[PDB]
Design a protein around this ligand. Structure first.
Ligand SMILES: [Zn+2]
Ligand SMILES: [Zn+2]
Length: 88
């Protein structure tokens, strides 16, 4: 017993330009798509919690981080700091 397939087809899904929330590509003025820097996942300016602005997505020198990460990265939990080099 062993079932296996070989070869894939080509379709919108393949492109991989759809968000992770609704998993779609539909976009528009304001309801554009965004790509995280950590998880590198697609999040529709809308689908995402924090209403992402068009200017934000445009900002080439801007670091966008999806909640999923923002909540994770946050370990210090605004609590007492044991160790950590303070930087600008
Ligand atoms: Zn979506
Ligand atoms: Zn992320």
């Amino acid at each position: 017993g062993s079932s296996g397939s070989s070869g894939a087809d080509d379709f919108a899904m393949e492109m991989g330009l759809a968000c992770v929330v609704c998993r779609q590509m539909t976009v528009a003025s304001g309801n554009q798509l965004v790509e995280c820097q950590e998880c590198h996942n697609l999040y529709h300016q809308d689908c995402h919690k924090p209403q992402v602005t068009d200017k934000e997505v445009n900002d080439p020198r801007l670091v966008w981080y999806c909640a999923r990460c923002t909540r994770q990265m946050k370990r210090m939990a605004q609590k007492n700091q044991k160790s950590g080099p303070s930087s600008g």
